[PDB]
Design a protein around this nucleic acid. Structure first.
Lengths: 111, 315, 111, 122, 110, 111
RNA sequence: UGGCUCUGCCAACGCUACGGCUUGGCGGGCUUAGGUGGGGUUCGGCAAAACGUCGAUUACUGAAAAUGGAAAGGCGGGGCCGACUU
RNA sequence: AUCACCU
């Protein structure tokens, strides 16, 4: 869209510094965290372009995967790269782009 | 090994074995719904088999009888048993037992009859092949030999699960049936070699060759063998003969004179091909009739690893 | 429940397998990166499954779980070291089996 | 015990995967011998080699024949990757023996895929 | 037509490709994905032009707007500065040239 | 038409050495050239398996994206420029496959 | 596995927000089993040990063999020392 | 028996 991406930019702008703090050790994960962080604005921009909710739900799945990545980087990534503080704020920003996504789902799923 | 063996369900379920069992169960079957459904979470299923056998919660899934097949877990549990239970039974098997012993095998059996047909220049021979070995193994006086060597309460229970301690019918179609049939007919080996002081013989599960340098003695031996295996082992003797070594010992697929060894193998090949055809003919229901037939005649030529052969090529 | 439970149980698969999949030598790079893309990237299939409640995606979650199982089979049957030792395949297979059970129950639920 | 039930139990995927695991088990060592160079083609070979399992697996846990045909396309691309690894990877990547061997294993998986494609099409 | 955007998009590429190689290794996944959105957005045009399901043209605009994102991300990326804001404007001149073409091509196919 | 993947195998036979040689410098482009070079066989092996002219158009796209990669790697500068000769002795090879695909696209659009 | 979100040096496709970055060197660190099909069988000795079996799940130890446990001894040959031959 | 595959 435009506003979801601008609100997701805030997720990226918060999470990308976190993803760059992940050590070389877990560099292969941040590849796919950033391929899910940075790569999710493909799915928010591909959902923007493609009114089909398939790519919107794909956008929702990506947001949910990004929320997993928060969980993962905070714990499952063993040096819990994201701290539980940094999840909670990043999940606020994910929830604000999940607000728009759930409300974009809403505005697409009218009939 | 020290009699006893009173702690084998520990070794049967000792992963290191339950994996050997696994690799033995899967060998050749790595294309069986059973392996492929097991292979998925294979080592979780082995840990749940380590656990179901360690805890004696194991139940043998019902035999799928077309030849009674099992599951993969079942054949694994048998492979686990007959990795610990087989070497404590195939140690008391008089060397002249030649079935389901990897060392002393089919070929060594045909070589052995020849061997002790050469030496002692046997003037005479006894074939005393058993009838329904598997279908008439006491599965009860079997478990008086699978209980004089196991002495482990829970192995004995695993044996009794993998093979109920009741009936008269070792399910041909199992690795524990193989082993226990050798063990069971090992009682007639130990009525040939021990009692009957008959040093020259050979057996593969049901086929009991007993080359002896005198004729009427070999007919005695046989009568004594039949009376034993009937009264003690409920194994009717289907065919027997006391032939001069010249008729040839129709042992184990060969016809074993001291000197030559004319592979008569034909019944087998005929049956192999017959099963073969039946399956790539869609006629897998008259095959049960044929199978029942051939399970009567020249299956008392212990051609059951061939029955499992053709339980696998064809279904 | 269902998706949330499966993912929390699959977290423990990743909680075990991600360390295994990060230790995999760079020799087995694409094994390590495709193990991870089927480890971490299986939450994607769990997400889509729950997000959609279409049995096809809880089956493709099973396909990811089964590809995950291949990966343990393969990272066992990798040959420079042995990547995933069979204990780590075993424990992983136990964890993936628990995920398989919940996915199985979830598949059953929808079926 | 009950073998841990994966869902959509598909014989063909399981078999094809077990038989394709032999392709991988053969080809992965000889992808992992591809030089330090030629390593992006090996990335893609492996991503093609090791990633064909996913193609089979998703095909088995699909009823979609599209996924079955996509698994066939991947086997054909892997069949290609043999051609490439043999000839075009200029050092060597795959000896004619290694290809002759690998092509045999891929052909086994090709057979199982063909049979699987066939059984669904009816 | 596909050849028009792609050649005008090679000005994006030819501009942003030295820029996307000068993105810090530190920002290497964003660089590899900037480049995989720079290069490989030509693939979204070419798909859109060699085929023409207009979904493929929206995916082309998506990549162009994801490219615009990569600009607006790689500028203000983090500490190792990547794309300067100037480069983002200059790039966005050329990304808006293919924006115009692909957009007018969307419009013309629509 | 499966002389395509054997005429295109002569594109790869040319363009793959002209890709192993794009240095690390241009290794995101090399990876993406090799995924358009090597991974155009996939589009010709998907083609021959869904005559469905779409996949042959998507393999025309991959030949045209290979022609882009040709013209890109030329203008990649330094001793990594795909020599104008190579762009021309590969656009000859890609145009061979372009004409076999021109025929495939013809022979399948015209039933 | 051409790496490294990796440095130090250095140089320039470059690109700089002027810091660097990039990128290249240049060092350094980090990086038998399985699949698929379908005559040593010699002659001798010891048969001691071992191994097997019966003894024996015995005696025994211990309420109880309780997933402890022999042995003498018998029976073997499977075993052994040898020759030859493998 | 054949096939891989290293000791």
């Amino acid at each position: 869209q435009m506003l979801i991406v601008e609100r997701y930019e805030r997720v990226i702008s918060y999470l990308y510094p976190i993803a760059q703090s992940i050590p070389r050790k877990h560099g292969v994960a941040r590849e796919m965290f950033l391929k899910c962080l940075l790569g999710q604005v493909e799915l928010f921009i591909v959902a923007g372009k493609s009114n089909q909710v398939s790519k919107l739900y794909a956008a929702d799945a990506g947001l949910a995967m990004l929320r997993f990545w928060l969980r993962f980087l905070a714990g499952i990534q063993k040096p819990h790269a994201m701290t539980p503080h940094q999840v909670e704020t990043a999940q606020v920003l994910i929830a604000e782009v999940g607000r728009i996504l759930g409300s974009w789902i809403a505005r697409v799923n009218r009939k | 090994m020290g009699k006893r063996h009173r702690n084998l369900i520990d070794q049967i379920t000792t992963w290191e074995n339950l994996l050997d069992a696994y690799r033995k169960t899967s060998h050749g079957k790595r294309r069986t719904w059973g392996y492929l459904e097991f292979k998925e979470y294979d080592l979780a299923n082995l840990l749940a088999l380590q656990a179901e056998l360690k805890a004696g919660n194991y139940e043998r899934g019902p035999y799928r009888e077309f030849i009674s097949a099992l599951e993969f877990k079942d054949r694994l549990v048998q492979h686990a048993l007959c990795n610990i239970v087989a070497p404590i039974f195939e140690a008391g098997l008089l060397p002249y037992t030649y079935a389901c012993r990897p060392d002393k095998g089919t070929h060594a059996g045909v070589c052995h009859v020849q061997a002790e047909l050469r030496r002692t220049r046997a003037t005479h021979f006894l074939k005393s092949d058993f009838s329904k070995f598997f279908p008439s193994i006491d599965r009860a006086a079997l478990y008086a030999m699978i209980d004089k060597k196991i002495h482990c309460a829970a192995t004995r229970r695993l044996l009794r699960v993998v093979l109920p301690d009741e009936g008269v019918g070792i399910p041909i179609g199992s690795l524990t049936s193989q082993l226990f049939a050798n063990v069971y007919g090992g009682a007639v080996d130990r009525l040939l070699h021990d009692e009957l002081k008959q040093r020259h013989w050979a057996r593969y599960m049901d086929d009991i060759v007993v080359l002896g340098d005198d004729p009427e003695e070999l007919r005695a031996v046989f009568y004594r063998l039949r009376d034993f295996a009937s009264e003690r082992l409920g194994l009717k003797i289907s065919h027997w003969q006391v032939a001069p070594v010249s008729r040839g010992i129709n042992f184990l697929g060969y016809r074993i004179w001291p000197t030559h060894k004319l592979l008569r193998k034909s019944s087998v090949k005929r049956a192999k091909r017959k099963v073969a055809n039946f399956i790539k003919h869609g006629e897998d229901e008259s095959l049960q009739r044929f199978l029942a037939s051939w399970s009567g005649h020249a299956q008392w030529a212990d051609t059951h690893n061939l029955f499992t052969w053709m339980e696998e090529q064809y279904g």
